[PDB]
């Protein structure tokens, strides 16, 4: 009964915070800092390893910028889904955790849209939903055929690999990210383009869910880079950058380089935080540079880990593609830098809510030298 207590504590904690927030709901404290702190303390009870500690760090940072009890509760639900995804041992754990996370995305997207923004937000949420239903239905149908043929539910199968490919958003399963994340709030797009990835990478690495095929990462790298170069809108540039990078990361993760993907996801989170939560031109420039991979910033270390892993596998086509695609991506990032300081006078809203943004910019600048041992 003692092993069960560890899991039970999380539920008890979430329920009591939920009912406390409901009972103590008032206009005087719309930003429930106390509940945010209780949720952060609660999520420390699920840290068991280093990946769980990274999941906690990212969830806490995401929770800081959500406003209101409701949004923070749905982030805790996302965290619970992510924690269970890492521990999934068969098809049922994978399906259950990922579909719960999809539900939390649908709610978070819906509750962060203004009345004037409902026409486009609800359309993008509906398109995301229908595509998610296609993915889940094909997954469960194939899983049923596999369970019937083999008699057992084994997470080492092509069915799970293709499903996790959809979840990562590589090859041709990246369009939901483009459609949904363009029409949603900047914070929601940022937290759901980084945090979910860690769980999928952990599942792939731990459950041996790798394929010999390199076509999907090669496709994601080239499509993402070319689409980033041809995209007029800045949201699309940022969205396609993640497609390209996660394609390369997928290629690296299939070959067993788990440590490098777990370090990359953390650096990418810190790099994306300042560009997405744009308030200052300088913070945004340092973020764009880190995503680009410029050497003085922590982004260089993250890209270096992936490139270093690529040279070990000794696949020439991947290295050539990587160099050319990286150059094409660099042109898009230069476009972003040009738009801020070299095109026209820029005036932005004074949204002075830089919770972890200053810390992230500092961590990007300063972190390169401490983490130099990795590369």
């Amino acid at each position: 009964m003692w092993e069960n207590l560890w899991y039970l504590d999380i539920l008890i904690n979430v329920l009591i915070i939920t009912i406390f927030g409901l009972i103590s709901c008032s206009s005087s404290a719309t930003k429930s800092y106390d509940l945010k702190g209780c949720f952060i303390i609660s999520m420390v009870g699920g840290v068991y390893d280093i990946p769980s500690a990274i999941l906690w760090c990212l969830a806490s940072l995401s929770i800081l910028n959500f406003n209101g009890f409701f949004a923070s509760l749905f982030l805790v639900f996302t965290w619970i889904s992510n924690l269970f995804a890492m521990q999934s041992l068969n098809f049922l754990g994978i399906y259950l955790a990922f579909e719960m996370q999809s539900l939390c995305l649908l709610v978070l997207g819906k509750i962060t849209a203004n009345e004037n923004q409902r026409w486009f937000a609800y359309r993008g949420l509906l398109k995301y939903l229908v595509l998610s239903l296609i993915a889940g239905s094909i997954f469960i149908f194939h899983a049923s055929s596999s369970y019937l043929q083999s008699g057992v539910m084994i997470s080492d199968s092509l069915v799970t690999y293709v499903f996790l490919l959809f979840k990562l958003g590589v090859a041709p399963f990246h369009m939901y990210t483009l459609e949904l994340f363009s029409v949603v709030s900047r914070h929601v797009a940022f937290v759901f383009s980084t945090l979910p990835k860690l769980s999928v990478l952990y599942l792939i690495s731990n459950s041996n869910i790798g394929s010999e095929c390199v076509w999907w990462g090669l496709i994601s790298l080239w499509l993402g880079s070319i689409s980033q170069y041809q995209s007029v809108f800045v949201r699309s540039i940022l969205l396609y950058s993640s497609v390209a990078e996660i394609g390369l990361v997928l290629l690296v993760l299939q070959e067993g380089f788990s440590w490098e993907a777990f370090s990359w996801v953390s650096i990418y989170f810190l790099s994306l935080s300042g560009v997405w939560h744009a308030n200052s031109k300088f913070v945004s420039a340092i973020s764009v540079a880190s995503i680009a991979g410029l050497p003085p910033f922590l982004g260089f270390i993250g890209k270096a880990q992936i490139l270093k892993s690529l040279v070990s596998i000794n696949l020439g086509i991947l290295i050539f593609s990587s160099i050319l695609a990286a150059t094409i991506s660099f042109i898009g990032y230069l476009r972003l830098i040009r738009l801020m300081y070299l095109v026209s006078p820029v005036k932005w809203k004074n949204n002075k809510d830089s919770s972890f943004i200053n810390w992230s910019t500092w961590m990007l600048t300063v972190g390169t030298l401490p983490m130099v041992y990795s590369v």
Binding site: M1, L8, L11, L15, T18, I19, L22, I23, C25
Partner: protein, 121 residues
């Protein structure tokens, strides 16, 4: 009428008497058709025919959406509770059920607190 098709299903009984007896049998609950839903479908057909006969005889001569969603989710919660009542529960099965009920009562409390249960809207 489902019919056994293998010797093992027929309790390794040989002959063709058994096959004929099985095929021409009547639905009896204390024989080979126990817990059978075939009578229910015979009842559905009889009821439909009776209605069709009556129907044809003369011819010759936002709150609602909310209640629907809450109903569906509470109904699934009750569907989960149905297996528990169908077992002789132990102390640990009781506490799992209590956690489930606590989660349901929390969702109910949220509905009450937020004014969904009131039907003024």
């Amino acid at each position: 009428l489902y019919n056994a098709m293998t010797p093992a299903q027929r309790y390794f009984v040989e002959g063709e008497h058994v096959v004929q007896a099985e095929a021409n049998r009547d639905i009896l609950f204390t024989q080979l058709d126990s817990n059978s839903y075939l009578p229910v479908l015979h009842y559905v057909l009889v009821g439909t025919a009776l209605g069709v006969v009556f129907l044809v005889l003369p011819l010759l001569i936002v709150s609602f959406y909310i209640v629907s969603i809450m109903y569906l989710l509470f109904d699934i919660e009750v569907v989960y509770l149905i297996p528990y009542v169908m077992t002789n529960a132990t102390e640990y099965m009781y506490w799992v059920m209590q956690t489930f009920v606590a989660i349901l009562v929390g969702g109910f409390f949220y509905e009450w607190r937020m004014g969904a249960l009131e039907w003024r809207e």
